[PDB]
Hints:
- By secondary structure, the chain is of the alpha+beta class.
- The chain has twelve helices and ten strands.
- It folds into two domains: 4-188, 2-Layer Sandwich (Ribosomal Protein S5, domain 2), CATH 3.30.230.10; 189-322, 2-Layer Sandwich (Alpha-Beta Plaits), CATH 3.30.70.890.
- It is classed as transferase.
Amino acid sequence: HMMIAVKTCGKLYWAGEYAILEPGQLALIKDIPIYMRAEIAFSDSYRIYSDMNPDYSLIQETIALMGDFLAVRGQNLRPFSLAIYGKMEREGKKFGLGSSGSVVVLVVKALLALYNLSVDQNLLFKLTSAVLLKRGDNGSMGDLACIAAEDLVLYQSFDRQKVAAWLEEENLATVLERDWGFSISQVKPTLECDFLVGWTKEVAVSSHMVQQIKQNINQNFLTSSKETVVSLVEALEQGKSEKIIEQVEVASKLLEGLSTDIYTPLLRQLKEASQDLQAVAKSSGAGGGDCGIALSFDAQSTKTLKNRWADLGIELLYQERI
């Protein structure tokens, strides 16, 4: 009488923001080892637990979709109990690590496990994206790609409207079989450097400011953005530190050109602190707040980036030896 335990990580974009909303575009997304956890087991009635928070309807919709998928697999959903917790859970959506996306993947991994199923990256991405698509969501779905793979990944988006229409016209089994047109592949840098996440403690851009920004998206942006991602990836696999630094800067500038709202006073500051250091920093996500990222290429630059961030009131959220 043992319950099953699963975990889901978070994610942060490295490049491709906004451009990724256009089908066929590319994005570089990093997985963060700050986990959301759940325990699951069959019981007398259906129950969702929290230690004596996440979107309740989101969890319910995921469970419903999973009941459909299990039905297709010749199995039936029965009363079970799900408990959700973990650092990601303790403090809602502060960080901007994709809480909402991590819950969907979490519930899906939980139910699949309870039913002795272990699907591949793409199917897990399809099941999770499906819930959001049925929900009307139109984001790129890059977060789920990164979270379903738990690797630094190169993501090529797909047309959501298309697949979303499929889900209201065809039966789940039919949609899951088709080709959505997305691509998820791991990226392995061949250099050793420090990756730092600086949290500005600021709320991210809202819906109005978001729409306004994408409305600024135009062909030069998409074309240059896609090229930059290709170069950053090459630079990472080829390991040219001076090359990674240039492209990240290019990417950062391509964003400032899209809208001055992405970069806020603290974010600029988070970025400026990279000056004259063998490192590079940049905004990550919808922008307007949340986190900023940095890659440092020597112990000295790293120590100085940290001290500068602390003095600026920027909280070191995470650190990893790429």
